[PDB]
C-alpha cells in the first residue's frame, strides 16, 4: 500500500496545484451585473471582468480595485483589505506553497533518505490550504464591500483547498509510516 499512497499523494498534489493555478488565472469567479467598458450580466475573476451576451460580448476590463472618490484614509482596515484583495497575495501564496510541496514530493522520491522532506511537503500542503481559505474569505469580504453567483473558478479553488488538505494528511501519514518503520528496524537490530 506504500506505492498506492505515494501515487495518490503525487496525483493529488498535481491536481490541487493545477486547480489553484487555473482558478487564479481564469476569470469565471463571479457572475454579476456590471459594465465592461473602461448594467449587463458579466463574469469576473481576480483581475478582469468581462461581459457575456448583449452587445459587448467577449470584452474584458481590468477590475478597478480602488473604487470610490474623496480618497480618505481615516480607516486602515478597509485599505488593508482592499490592498490584500487587489494583490491576491493569498491565492498566489497558495499556488506557490502547492508548488513547493510538489517539489518536496519530487525531491523525496529522488533523495529517498531524508524523511524530513515528506514532512515539509505535508506542511506546505496544509499551509496552502490555509492560505486558500484566507484568500476565499478576503475575496468574498471584498465583494461584499444585487444578485450574484459563483463560477467554476471559485469552485476550482474550493476543490483545490480540499485536495490540498487531503494530500497533506496523506503526506503526514507517509512521514509517520517512514519513522515507524525506521524505529521498528532500529529496535529489531538492537
Amino acid at each position: 500500500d506504500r506505492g498506492v499512497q505515494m501515487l495518490l499523494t503525487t496525483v493529488g498534489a498535481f491536481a490541487a496545484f493545477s486547480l489553484m493555478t487555473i482558478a487564479v488565472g481564469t476569470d469565471y469567479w463571479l457572475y454579476s451585473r456590471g459594465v465592461c467598458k473602461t448594467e449587463v450580466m458579466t463574469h469576473s475573476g481576480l483581475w478582469r471582468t468581462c461581459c457575456l451576451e448583449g452587445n459587448f460580448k467577449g470584452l474584458c476590463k481590468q477590475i478597478d480595485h480602488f473604487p470610490e472618490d474623496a480618497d480618505y484614509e481615516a480607516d486602515t482596515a478597509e485599505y488593508f483589505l482592499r490592498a490584500v484583495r487587489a494583490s491576491s497575495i493569498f491565492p498566489i501564496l497558495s499556488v506557490i506553497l502547492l508548488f513547493m510541496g510538489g517539489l518536496c514530493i519530487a525531491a523525496s522520491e529522488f533523495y529517498k533518505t531524508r524523511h524530513n522532506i515528506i514532512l515539509s511537503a505535508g506542511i506546505f500542503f496544509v499551509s496552502a490550504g490555509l492560505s486558500n481559505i484566507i484568500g476565499i474569505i478576503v475575496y468574498i469580504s471584498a465583494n461584499a464591500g444585487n444578485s450574484y453567483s459563483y463560477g467554476w473558478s471559485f469552485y476550482f479553488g474550493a476543490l483545490s483547498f480540499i485536495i490540498a488538505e487531503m494530500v497533506g494528511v496523506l503526506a503526514v501519514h507517509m512521514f509517520i509510516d517512514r519513522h515507524k518503520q525506521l524505529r521498528a528496524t532500529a529496535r529489531a537490530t538492537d
Binding site: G122, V126, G129, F161, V169, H173, I176, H179, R183, A184
Partner: protein
C-alpha cells in the same frame, strides 16, 4: 401570491451560504492541523502506538463535537494541539452564538414572493436525522458483510 412558508432546510437561513462553506472548510482545516500537530512528531510515539489518540478520524470527531457544543472522550494535551483546540473553541462560541441568536425567528418567516414552533418548521431536521440513522445502519451492515466475507475466506 400565496404566502410562502420556509423550506425544509430553513435551519440554514440564519447564516449565509458563504459562511456555511467557510465553516465546512475551517472544520476540515482545523481537523487536519490538529491531527498534524498531534501525530507528525516521532517523539509523540512510544506496534509502536502513539502517546495521544488524535488520528485524523479522531481529530475530525473531536472538531465536530466541539463545534456542536457536545464534547467527546478525548482532549488535546500538547501545547500546539491545545492552541488548535482553544482557537476552534473561540470560533465555535462566536459562530454558534450568532447562529442561534434568532433561529426560531428564521424558522417561521413568511415571504411575499409569538406562537409555538410547529412540526412543519423542523420537519427538515427530523428528515435529516432519520436519513442519518438509515445511512449508519447501512454502513454498519456493509461492514458486517465485509467482515463475514473475510472470515469465510479465512476459515475455508
Amino acid at each position: 401570491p400565496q404566502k410562502s412558508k420556509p423550506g425544509v432546510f430553513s435551519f440554514l437561513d440564519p447564516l449565509a451560504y458563504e459562511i456555511w462553506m467557510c465553516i465546512v472548510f475551517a472544520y476540515i482545516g482545523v481537523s487536519v492541523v490538529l491531527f498534524l500537530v498531534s501525530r507528525f512528531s516521532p517523539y509523540e510515539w512510544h506496534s509502536s502506538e502513539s502517546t495521544n489518540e488524535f488520528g485524523i478520524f479522531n481529530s475530525l470527531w473531536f472538531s465536530l463535537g466541539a463545534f456542536m457544543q457536545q464534547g467527546c472522550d478525548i482532549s488535546p494535551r500538547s501545547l500546539s494541539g491545545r492552541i488548535v483546540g482553544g482557537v476552534w473553541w473561540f470560533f465555535t462560541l462566536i459562530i454558534i452564538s450568532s447562529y442561534t441568536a434568532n433561529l426560531a425567528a428564521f424558522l417561521t418567516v413568511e415571504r411575499m414572493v409569538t406562537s409555538a414552533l410547529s412540526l412543519s418548521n423542523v420537519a427538515g431536521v427530523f428528515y435529516i436525522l432519520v436519513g442519518g440513522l438509515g445511512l449508519a445502519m447501512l454502513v454498519a451492515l456493509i461492514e458486517f458483510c465485509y467482515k463475514s466475507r473475510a472470515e469465510a475466506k479465512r476459515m475455508k
